[PDB]
């Protein structure tokens, strides 16, 4: 065990250096540093990882409300922080604002003709600020457009990406925006001061998804690259995780230290910062399809997790939306129930309160026309979640 | 004219070398006490047959 002895001795030597740094950190100077540690511990206590999986019960099809106003398949959707309105976009290049309580259309942004502002190509991603003030949408025309959420008034048009924009997410509590594209670059945008900050590199293929939280940090899915990367912007560091096989299409953060991702080979994985490889791996989350001898698992199109809890929802074209439970330490994933819903689940977003789940249903996949489901309706479905102890 | 040669340069001669040994080459190698395979590898830094 020569390799083990060298690794063990090297670990002992590394601990000596950390002791010297701790003494210098111990030396409002150090009092302010200790106050920062207290807030972080209290913040950790804020994310107490509340267990609400058992109280969730499967709803009924009659309870599910179906809003139909889009011409083509819905690609993405977001929920306003106040849980009052839903913004949705589709392949018809239009954006429609829906009222959660009534289901009527509040405002409709038409497709720009080839001069009212609008999108001339398919809209792939949308993000909304934590205060509900700003709305951002990305399209295939390498453009990012900013809208005033309350009035749907166009404000800014961000240029600079060299390919289609695929991911957008606002930093929670701020107006800082992170954007990614098929040009393998990640850019930083400050919406309030309508300025460009910097560009980050490191991905080797087209980026599929992006998510962020209150920390000055974001995660991205590598697609065909097969890697998921954590971007430490102030520290100027990049973490690389190697996990499940196949293209990684969708991702969602569970808390500040965990995330869930979905792949095109049916695998769903739970990740942790401590371990490079995924902690949990659920293979064939939505079953298998195909003729005998040519069977392949259903593609995972969207994933979602309820913030600071253990509830995970995965969407595919297997005509059902599945609810999952994260195990202790996020090491096990357990299926709760199946919500019958026919079509491609292109988007899944939990409400801020957690009382309902919004699913985007389209006849086709959000990235192409490889499948077309005639029985599916291009609609935004509000799935009510009822909690009884 | 062989296609291997780019004028006077032999391109298909590769790092695995196949070499013809003469009868007097063996005897003089023993007289100088030079190991046959080992000394050839020192000259070329490659596998020699």
């Amino acid at each position: 065990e020569t390799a083990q002895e060298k690794k063990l001795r090297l670990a002992k030597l590394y601990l000596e250096q950390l002791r010297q740094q701790e003494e210098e950190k111990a030396e409002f100077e150090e009092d302010q540093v200790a106050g920062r540690l207290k807030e972080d511990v209290l913040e950790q206590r804020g994310r107490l990882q509340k267990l609400v999986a058992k109280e969730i019960q499967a709803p009924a099809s009659a309870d599910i409300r179906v809003l139909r106003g889009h011409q083509l398949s819905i690609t993405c959707l977001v929920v306003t922080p106040d849980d009052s309105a839903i913004f949705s976009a589709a392949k018809d290049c239009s954006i429609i604002k829906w009222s959660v309580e009534s289901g009527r259309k509040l405002h409709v942004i038409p497709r720009a003709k080839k001069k009212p502002p609008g999108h001339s190509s398919h809209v792939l991603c949308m993000a909304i600020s934590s205060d509900g003030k700003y709305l951002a949408s990305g399209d295939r025309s390498k453009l990012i457009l900013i809208w005033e959420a309350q009035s749907c008034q166009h404000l800014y048009t961000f240029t600079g990406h060299r390919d289609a924009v695929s991911g957008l997410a606002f930093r929670r509590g701020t107006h800082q925006l992170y954007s990614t594209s098929h040009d393998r670059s990640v850019k930083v945008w400050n919406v309030a001061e309508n300025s460009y900050v910097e560009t980050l590199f490191g991905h080797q293929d087209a980026v599929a998804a992006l998510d962020a939280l209150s920390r000055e940090c974001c995660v991205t899915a590598g697609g065909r690259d097969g890697t998921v990367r954590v971007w430490k912007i102030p520290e100027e560091s990049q973490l690389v995780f190697y996990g499940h096989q196949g293209s990684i299409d969708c991702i969602h953060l569970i808390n500040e230290e965990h995330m869930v991702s979905g792949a095109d080979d049916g695998s769903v994985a739970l990740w942790g910062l401590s371990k490079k490889r995924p902690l949990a791996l659920q293979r064939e989350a939505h079953g298998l399809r195909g003729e005998p001898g040519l069977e392949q698992p259903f593609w995972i199109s969207s994933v979602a997790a309820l913030l600071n809890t253990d509830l995970v929802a995965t969407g595919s074209h297997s005509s059902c939306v599945r609810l999952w439970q994260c195990g202790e330490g996020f090491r096990q994933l357990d299926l709760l129930c199946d919500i019958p819903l026919v079509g491609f689940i292109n988007s899944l977003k939990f409400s801020s309160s957690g009382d309902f789940l919004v699913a985007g249903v389209g006849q086709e996949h959000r990235l192409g026309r490889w499948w077309r489901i005639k029985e599916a309706r291009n609609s935004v479905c509000i799935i009510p979640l009822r909690r009884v102890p | 004219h062989p296609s291997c040669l780019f004028f006077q340069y032999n391109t298909q001669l590769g790092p695995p070398y196949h070499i013809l040994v003469d009868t007097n080459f063996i005897n003089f190698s023993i007289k100088a006490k030079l190991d046959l395979v080992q000394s050839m590898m020192d000259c070329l830094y490659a596998k020699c047959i």
């Binding site: - | 291997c4 001669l13 695995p16």
Partner: protein, 237 residues
């Protein structure tokens, strides 16, 4: 341009027996059509005054490239029995059947069932072709269908070409017969260089009691390809 349809042209015999030269603005290599009025793979044919010849494409056949490259002997002459290993669909086999004529016989061996159906359809029209749908690695499995032959032509493209040819040569090839083997250097050993492969293949032929006589490359039409012509069990002189 090229040899457009409707152009006057002259046909003269080649140095090799059964092969002809199509002299004109361009020169093409042609063979006499055993079944007049039919094209096997869309080649251009010439009508001669009852007599018809078919052009030979050296890019789709390895025997034509060797002839155009300046080989000495092909040993395929009218009235000879030829064993062909790796017939595939039969593009080269059709030209071989033209050379041997009605008196000669061609034995076509092809393991693939997809390409095997094409040989049978070709064997419908040409009475001198005997299709054999069997693996060339086991000559004992079709020893009933084949008598003694004069020339063995191999285009099997396998790492074990010499072993396959030697097994067939011992069983079916007569004393004093000849063999023509096409070697694709990338197929036997990709790691070794092309010419170092050619020296190794020649050596293995000598260890199988076969005497190679000549070799040449097919450089204008193929890359890293060689053709070896030799004799099996030579008679005393």
């Amino acid at each position: 341009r090229g040899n457009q349809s409707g152009k006057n042209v002259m046909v003269e015999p080649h140095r090799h027996e059964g092969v002809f030269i199509c002299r004109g603005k361009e020169d093409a290599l042609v063979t006499k059509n055993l079944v007049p009025g039919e094209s096997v793979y869309g080649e251009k044919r010439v009508s001669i005054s009852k007599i018809e010849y078919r052009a030979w494409n050296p890019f789709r056949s390895k025997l034509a490239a060797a002839i155009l490259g300046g080989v000495d002997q092909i040993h395929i002459k009218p009235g000879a029995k030829v064993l062909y290993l790796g017939a595939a669909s039969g593009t080269t086999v059709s030209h071989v059947s033209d050379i041997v004529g009605p008196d000669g016989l061609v034995y076509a061996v092809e393991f693939s069932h997809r390409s095997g159906r094409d040989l049978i359809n070709l064997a419908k029209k040409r009475t001198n072709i005997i299709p054999v749908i069997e693996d060339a690695r086991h000559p004992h499995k079709y020893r009933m269908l084949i008598a003694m032959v004069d020339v063995i032509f191999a285009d099997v493209a396998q790492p074990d070409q010499t072993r396959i040819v030697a097994l067939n040569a011992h069983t079916f090839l007569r004393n004093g017969g000849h063999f023509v083997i096409s070697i694709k250097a990338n197929c036997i050993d990709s790691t070794a260089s092309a010419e170092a492969v050619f020296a190794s293949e020649v050596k293995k032929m000598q260890q199988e009691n076969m005497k190679p006589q000549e070799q040449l490359t097919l450089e204008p039409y193929e890359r890293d390809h060689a053709v070896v012509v030799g004799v099996y069990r030579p008679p005393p002189k």
